[PDB]
Amino acid sequence: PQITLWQRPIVTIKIGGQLREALLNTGADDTVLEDIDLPGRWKPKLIVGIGGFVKVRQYEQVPIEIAGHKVVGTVLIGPTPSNIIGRNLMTQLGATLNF
């Protein structure tokens, strides 16, 4: 799609049977979601949060649909004030900023 920026660029995402929303955030390196669960192994990761650091779970090779487009990549699961799609998945989408 072509998404204008008059409002926050929030899109529908889906991971397995979990339909959620998230912000397309070109200021974020990584993708972090609070309200989904994934099975199996993960690696711990620190991200910045208001105490200093927040521990999240890094899951690799996750199939995710973003605004109806399927990609595969890394998803962090843990506390976040909003669900964020970062550049790691936007690069998998072939997303660009255009003006």
Which residues contribute to the site for Cl ion (CB under 5 A)?
7-8, 11-12, 16-17, 67, 73-74, 88
Residue with smaller CB distance to Cl ion, 17 or 27: 17
CA distances from 37 to 50, 61, 91 (A): 23, 14, 23
CB of 70 to Cl ion, least distance (A): 13
CB of 79 to Cl ion, least distance (A): 20
CB of 53 to Cl ion, least distance (A): 21
Residue with smaller CB distance to Cl ion, 40 or 51: 40
CA distances from 77 to 5, 7, 35, 55, 95 (A): 26, 25, 8, 9, 22
